[PDB]
Structure 1
Amino acid sequence: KMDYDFKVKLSSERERVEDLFEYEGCKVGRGTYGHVYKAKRKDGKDDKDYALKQIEGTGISMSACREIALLRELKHPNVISLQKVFLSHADRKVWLLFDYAEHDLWHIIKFHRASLPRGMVKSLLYQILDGIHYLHANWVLHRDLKPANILVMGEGPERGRVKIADMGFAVTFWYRAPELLLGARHYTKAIDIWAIGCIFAELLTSEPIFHCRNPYHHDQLDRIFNVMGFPADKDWEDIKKMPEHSTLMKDFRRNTYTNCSLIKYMEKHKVKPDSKAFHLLQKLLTMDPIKRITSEQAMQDPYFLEDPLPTSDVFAGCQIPYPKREFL
Structure 2
Amino acid sequence: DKMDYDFKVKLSSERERVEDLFEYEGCKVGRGTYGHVYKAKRKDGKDDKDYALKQIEGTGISMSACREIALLRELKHPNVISLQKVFLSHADRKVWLLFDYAEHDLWHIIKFHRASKVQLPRGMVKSLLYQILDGIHYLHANWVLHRDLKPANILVMGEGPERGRVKIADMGFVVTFWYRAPELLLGARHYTKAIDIWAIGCIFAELLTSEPIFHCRQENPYHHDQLDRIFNVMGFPADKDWEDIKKMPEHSTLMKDFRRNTYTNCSLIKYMEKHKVKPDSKAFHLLQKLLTMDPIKRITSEQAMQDPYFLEDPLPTSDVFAGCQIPYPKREFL
Is the TM value for this pair above 0.5?
A: yes
TM-score (norm 2): 0.97
Q: Which runs of 4+ in 1 moved over 3 A?
A: none
Describe the superposition over 1:131-177 as per-residue Cα deviations: whole angstroms up to 9, x where unpaired.
00000000000000000000000000000000000000170000000
Q: Residue in 1 aligned with 2:305?
A: 299
Distance 2:331 2:215 in 1: 25
Q: Give SS of 2:122's match.
A: coil
Q: CA deviation at 1:327?
A: 1.3
Distance 1:143 1:322 in 2: 27
Distance 1:19 1:281 in 2: 48
8 Å CA contact retained: 1:27, 1:327: yes
Distance 1:45 1:193 in 2: 41
Equivalence map 1:43-82=2 (5 Å)? 43-82=44-83
Q: CA deviation at 1:45?
A: 1.4
Distance 2:187 2:236 in 1: 18
Distance 2:62 2:231 in 1: 40
Q: Residue in 1 aligned with 2:197?
A: 193
Deviates most, 41-50 or 14-23: 41-50
Distance 2:317 2:83 in 1: 25
8 Å CA contact retained: 1:273, 1:279: yes
1:37–1:317 Cα change, 3 Å: same
Percent identity at matched positions? 100
Q: CA deviation at 1:189?
A: 0.1
Distance 1:179 1:111 in 2: 32
Equivalence map 1:136-151=2 (5 Å)? 136-151=140-155
8 Å CA contact retained: 1:79, 1:165: yes
Q: CA deviation at 1:46?
A: 2.0
Q: Residue in 2 aligned with 1:326?
A: 332
Distance 2:99 2:193 in 1: 25
Q: Give SS of 1:119's match.
A: helix
Q: Give SS of 2:37's match.
A: strand
Q: Give SS of 1:9's match.
A: helix
1:118–1:253 Cα change, 3 Å: closer
Distance 1:118 1:256 in 2: 34
Distance 1:280 1:326 in 2: 34
Aligned residues: 328
1:170–1:47 Cα change, 3 Å: farther
Distance 1:198 1:291 in 2: 16
1:117–1:225 Cα change, 3 Å: closer
Distance 1:215 1:169 in 2: 18
1:118–1:270 Cα change, 3 Å: closer
Describe the superposition over 1:200-248 as per-residue Cα deviations: whole angstroms up to 9, x where unpaired.
0000000000000010000000000000000000000000000000000
Distance 2:228 2:207 in 1: 22
Q: CA deviation at 1:47?
A: 1.9
- Structure 1 gaps of 5+ residues are none
1:170–1:222 Cα change, 3 Å: closer
Q: Give SS of 1:130's match.
A: helix
Distance 2:155 2:48 in 1: 21
Distance 1:70 1:175 in 2: 24
8 Å CA contact retained: 1:31, 1:170: no
1:104–1:151 Cα change, 3 Å: same
8 Å CA contact retained: 1:117, 1:315: no
Distance 1:265 1:147 in 2: 20
1:170–1:43 Cα change, 3 Å: farther
Distance 1:154 1:219 in 2: 37
Q: Give SS of 2:84's match.
A: strand
Equivalence map 1:135-284=2 (5 Å)? 135-169=139-173, 171-213=175-217, 214-284=220-290
8 Å CA contact retained: 1:30, 1:170: no
Deviates most, 199-208 or 39-48: 39-48
RMSD, matched Cα: 0.7
Distance 2:183 2:289 in 1: 16
Is it true that 1:124 corresponds to 2:100 in the alignment? no
Describe the superposition over 1:52-103 as per-residue Cα deviations: whole angstroms up to 9, x where unpaired.
0000011000010000000000000000000000000010000000110000
Q: CA deviation at 1:43?
A: 0.4
Deviates most, 40-49 or 132-141: 40-49
Deviates most, 67-76 or 168-177: 168-177
Distance 1:111 1:8 in 2: 52
Q: Give SS of 1:67's match.
A: helix
Distance 1:8 1:305 in 2: 60
Describe the superposition over 1:252-287 as per-residue Cα deviations: whole angstroms up to 9, x where unpaired.
000000000000000000000000000000000000
Q: CA deviation at 1:108?
A: 0.3
Distance 1:175 1:58 in 2: 31
Q: CA deviation at 1:117?
A: 3.8
Q: CA deviation at 1:118?
A: 4.7
